[PDB]
């Protein structure tokens, strides 16, 4: 008897076969293109996509006017549209089976900081977010994997206390300007 919860889940699955060249090359491609730390982040996003595809196939086995199929398919499609992975006009459970890992990778905060020109590269974007230079609508975010919603796409701003933002300079600039 403790007032503690023990509920937790693993957020990835390891691949079944360890050393396959095509899978290794595809994972390395996605790591390099999206500036990721290791293979586990690719496996995490792959796990999320596999769970969503399993939910879509399960709802596709149901008949069209099943209330659970309509309710849960509508909720799943609404979530996928809300994080920008699917288009608003493609709200249909068949198109979920055509989704790719690259859309979920593009909706990360690292990729959006790169694509909105706040960073000169994807690795610059990662080190920018990690060092409290980025805010999303009011809130400083450190997490590169922060998945951005379409309502927060236009509010990625740039940290009103950051030296490149609000203006108060960093440690190096005060130390170097103090010499002379």
């Amino acid at each position: 008897p403790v007032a503690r919860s023990w509920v937790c889940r693993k957020t990835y699955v390891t691949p079944r076969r360890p050393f396959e060249k095509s899978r290794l090359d595809q994972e390395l491609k996605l790591i390099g293109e999206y500036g990721l730390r290791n293979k586990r982040e690719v496996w995490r996003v792959k796990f999320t996509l596999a769970k969503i595809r399993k939910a879509a196939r399960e709802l596709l086995t149901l008949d069209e006017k099943d209330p659970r199929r309509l309710f849960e398919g509508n909720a799943l499609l609404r979530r996928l549209v809300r994080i920008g992975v699917l288009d608003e006009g493609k709200m249909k459970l068949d198109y979920i089976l055509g989704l790719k890992i690259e859309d979920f990778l593009e909706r990360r905060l690292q990729t959006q900081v790169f694509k909105l020109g706040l960073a000169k590269s994807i690795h610059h974007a990662r080190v920018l977010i990690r060092q409290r230079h980025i805010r999303v609508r009011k809130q400083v975010v450190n997490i590169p994997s922060f998945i951005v919603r379409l309502d927060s796409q236009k509010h990625i701003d740039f940290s009103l206390r950051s030296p490149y933002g609000g203006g108060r300079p960093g440690r190096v600039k005060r130390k170097n300007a103090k010499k002379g």
Binding site: P1, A3, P67
Partner: protein, 262 residues
């Protein structure tokens, strides 16, 4: 065990109390009283979790034993006193009155009532017997014994009783076509008119009830509380009128409410 239990674990508490997992290992454990353990809302959960005058159980004790809370017109200072269906809670200091009646989801709604409606309550008659020197008694659902009832009042009927005195003031028969509210089972909280009662001797009767929207649902005879005569309830009802919406129309109503405001 070697004797009766005094503790209720929090995960083993009744789910409609809406307690969380991480506040403690214990739940408030209702006292013995006019209601069952699984079918009551203790006073500490009402004053702290629902109505939010208090932040801790110690503040609940400080509220209750200043003699502010009346249940059915009687001052109670037991913080775990089991209050249940149709019970009137009166706070004279803030001028508030409540009846503990169910939501459409089976949870005790915070239902505010008028101070003239707090003068009375309804009770379901659970037994009729004749005691010594030929004196008829009825026993209600909240452990009330009334001597000399009307000879027309039977078991499953509903008495309208005056909390100032405790005597029978009016009554409603169990009949097909009267309004009822479901107080147990899977249809807890729904309201409708009785359309058919089928009888199973040596077993449980099954009452069929039809909603005001035309939906039909059955329950046992134990789960039926007759509220109003024919079609008009004799007490105030919550915001939902016993109409259980499905998850689709509840989502639609939530989206329309979000669209209208915001």
């Amino acid at each position: 065990a070697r004797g009766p239990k005094k503790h209720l674990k929090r995960v083993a508490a009744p789910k409609h109390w809406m307690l969380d997992k991480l506040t403690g290992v214990f739940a408030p454990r209702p006292s013995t009283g006019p209601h069952k353990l699984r079918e009551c809302l203790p006073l500490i959960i009402f004053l702290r979790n629902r109505l939010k005058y208090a932040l801790t159980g110690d503040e609940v004790k400080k509220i209750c034993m200043q003699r502010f809370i009346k249940i059915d017109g009687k001052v109670r200072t037991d913080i775990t006193y089991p209050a249940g269906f149709m019970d009137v809670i009166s706070i004279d200091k803030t001028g508030e009155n409540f009846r503990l009646i169910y939501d459409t989801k089976g949870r005790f709604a915070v239902h505010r009532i008028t101070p003239e409606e707090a003068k009375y309550k309804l009770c379901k008659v659970r037994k009729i017997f004749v005691g010594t020197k030929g004196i008829p008694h009825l026993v209600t659902h909240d452990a009330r014994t009334i001597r000399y009832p009307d000879p027309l009042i039977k078991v499953n009927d509903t008495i309208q009783i005056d909390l100032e005195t405790g005597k029978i003031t009016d009554f409603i028969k169990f009949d097909t076509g009267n309004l009822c509210m479901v107080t147990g089972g899977a249809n807890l909280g729904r309201i409708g008119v009785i359309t058919n009662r089928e009888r199973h001797p040596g077993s449980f009767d099954v009452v069929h009830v039809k909603d005001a929207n035309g939906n039909s649902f059955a329950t046992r005879l134990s789960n039926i509380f007759v509220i109003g005569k024919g079609n008009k309830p004799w007490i105030s009802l919550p915001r939902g009128k016993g109409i259980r919406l499905t998850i689709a129309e509840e989502r639609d109503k939530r989206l329309a409410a979000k669209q209208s405001s915001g």
